[PDB]
Symmetry: D2
Subunit: 254 residues, 4 copies
């Protein structure tokens, strides 16, 4: 339980990685969605302690019950520190999140999948909560449209908003900013009139990666509920075998 | 070596998987191209033989020298069967492959990467060789262009040609067929005149995934060198979070 | 809607790939488990038809309701052929599947995740249903144990049973054969006495990949409910950076 | 070039991502090793500049020639900033790296593959260079061995050393530190005497993930060349479907 002097050094994170467990989450309409999560749970290990208890992190996942409300997630972080007899720990869980969506012209309903990561960290007595969402959208190239007699190259794009939250934000709030700022958002089901609509909206609203990151960042900068964010936009170029990438990091405290 | 009756059954494939190993390949331009390969080497195991020798498959990779050519690959398949004391075996290697390309208007030269898989199988008295290439290309939707006042949804597409070879075929020949049948091919480096060119040609040549596979299949059908093939085209839809997909399978001997 | 003569050729499969949709499944205890699936839905396209309707495949997923019982899956395949106006189609869905498990000595309960793929194909008037499960287990090397004064090298292994089913088989039935034939099965939560138990059981039951595939195959050969299977075992070697792979394919009809 | 006030904000990172390109690296043994790299090239964008030139980043890759050495990598970072007309930028390349290795007893020679990431960042008037290597090793559980009558659960482990360099360090030096501190290192080709050797040494040298990271950290702390580092060790538990994980982060300037 105690370290040799050559091993007398603290470990910032020690725990389980990639544990797959089912979870239930709460929508902005208060409804519960069943999803599967990949969990990472770790604690700080004091220089003197030889090792953590790995079994306890799995035990905590089995014990937990109910929707993963922002309140339960904070409770889980505190439960882990008590179960593991630790003073500092991180819990991270990623899962696919589905929003029912209405086609722009037809009104036909379809689910779209977003990748959501929720991270809680307790270090220096300070509890920090982060919500990260990957939103798939459509991007059209302004240069292609300007220099071409007809057509404009467009590609699927991923906008990743990772935000430290001062207060509760629904993920739908983060998804909405990316979808509104995108040349055009994505629907799973589109009838012919909808395809006409999204083809035309994207062309009318071309955006480089730089344009998209700046437009999304300005909206994030205005939401007080967000204290700090890392914003990434990746355009999977249709005319190339690589991607165009823009990153903006903001810490309002600083 | 020796099996119990309960374990007295032949194993069609036994050996090593995912062995990463450097390899040099003689190109159509006669350059020796150095690339990294993931190797799968396996042999049929007779009911009475309890196990193959795993170390020998790795030893063959270390022993082998010089550029990989169609003749060298066949020689390796025979060498392995002799080394492993086996009558039937399969060798599969997948590696990134690069072709220097010339931009359509400016003529600027850039590398484009393809995924090549070379597979040799000896079984039932027959030696079969297969060349599989994943070709990245551009696809433009004919419906989007027809129904829209402006624009046409376009996206990166992968054309996978998996061909059993009656006669040796350079990978470049398979890549060329896919690139020619695509709405537009892909270049790593495009100048603004090139960007204008590829935007326009894609628009002038819209193809559905069904149109793309059918056009590639017709070229494969006309090729005396290819006895049989499994052809796949996937369109990574810009307007959707999923892909459009088509597969044509054909055996000339049928 | 009709093909040019150069494009007058049938396409075996045309449809959507990698569509992520939530689904509910039924356990062998008849209970319902909520899981997320990646769906692939395609139909055969007659030479004359220019193209399928891609929107309909997504519409079918949105329309479907209730647990995905083996009876619903057959109904869905028929519904798709009618919705898409086709005569032949394939529906494939993969999802993580969780079984609550009891530790061997402590009796502590933990969930384990398996990858389950369910595939339905309707071609030549014939309906075929396939259930594929990836089961994670533990493998110990017989050679290492025999030649070493102490210790024996052991690694996580994946056993993949893909089976065409004459009649309904619960996935738990397929998982059980792999877990019983493995040097030792896997538990998410293990107390110290359980770790002693699984350390010792694995050592007492060493199995090469060949031994494991043959032991599992014999059990599959005995289950009439299975008409044909592809069995794969991969050992992720702890002493190497590659894997040991064994494959057995059986078609009882043949 | 020119921004609106709403888009008047700096972008910390803008450029190309996931560009695949061949590269040659001079090895510690002075051999020129040809490998395939995935490149990420980005530059800081000033608030007033509306966009970077994407084509130039690809042009630099095509233009660059000769083996990648520490000096050459620094020269490329400067070349890119001049080519892109930028004052701050990052270049990151990841490639498979092979070291010929000698078996512990038989002395047979086999290649072992590592994942190398070289990152150069110029920002805030400071140029920072980092070498990151993923080293595959073997880990044996000390608890399994102590509590069991026979055997000890062991598994492949990845040790990732991400080091900021005060002075140039060959990747081989980082790999050696991880291999020496591991229960046992990995060889591609092992003869039966070698198998006996590595089985026994691992058993005689059991390490927990906390023990492994602490031992590697002590070597890194003693190294004058490394100013700072993020050290990760992941044990892909044979007895579990998840991984044990530990991370130590250290900045000497702190
Ligand atoms: O590595 S664990 O068992 O503290
Ligand atoms: O499987 S989760 O990453 O969507
Ligand atoms: O997990 S996100 O907060 O980096
Ligand atoms: O799996 S055995 O034959 O090394
Ligand atoms: O191995 S490829 O030819 O399917
Ligand atoms: O729209 S489809 O038929 O490629
Ligand atoms: O995400 S499913 O493949 O487990
Ligand atoms: O999807 S399985 O049946 O090959
Ligand atoms: O090409 S743009 O994204 O500067
Ligand atoms: O880029 S690596 O040094 O984190
Ligand atoms: Na463009
Ligand atoms: Na379309
Ligand atoms: Na072994
Ligand atoms: Na253990």
């Amino acid at each position: 339980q105690s370290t040799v002097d050559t091993r007398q050094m603290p470990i910032q994170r020690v725990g389980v990685r990639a544990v797959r467990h089912p979870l239930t989450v709460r929508t902005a309409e208060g409804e519960t969605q069943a999803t599967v999560g990949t969990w990472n749970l770790d604690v700080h290990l004091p220089a003197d302690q030889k090792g953590t208890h790995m079994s306890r992190f799995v035990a905590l996942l089995e014990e937990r019950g109910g929707p993963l409300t922002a309140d339960a997630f904070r409770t889980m972080l505190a439960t882990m520190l008590e179960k593991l007899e630790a003073r500092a720990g991180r819990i991270e869980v990623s899962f696919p999140y589905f929003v029912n969506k209405t086609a722009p012209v037809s009104g036909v309903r379809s689910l779209l999948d977003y990748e959501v990561t929720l991270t809680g960290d307790v270090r220096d007595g300070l509890t920090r909560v982060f919500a990260k969402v990957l939103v798939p959208v459509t991007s059209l190239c302004p240069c292609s449209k300007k220099i071409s007699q007809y057509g404009a190259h467009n590609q699927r794009s991923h906008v990743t908003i990772d935000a430290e939250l001062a207060a509760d934000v629904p993920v739908e709030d983060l998804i909405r900013i990316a979808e509104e700022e995108a040349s055009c958002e994505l629907w799973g089901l589109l009838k012919r009139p909808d395809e006409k609509f999204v083809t035309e909206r994207a062309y009318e609203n071309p955006k480089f990666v730089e344009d998209l990151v700046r437009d999304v960042a300005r909206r994030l900068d205005a939401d007080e509920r967000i204290v700090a964010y890392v914003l990434e936009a990746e355009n999977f170029e249709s005319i190339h075998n690589h991607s165009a990438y823009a990153l903006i990091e903001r810490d309002k405290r600083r």
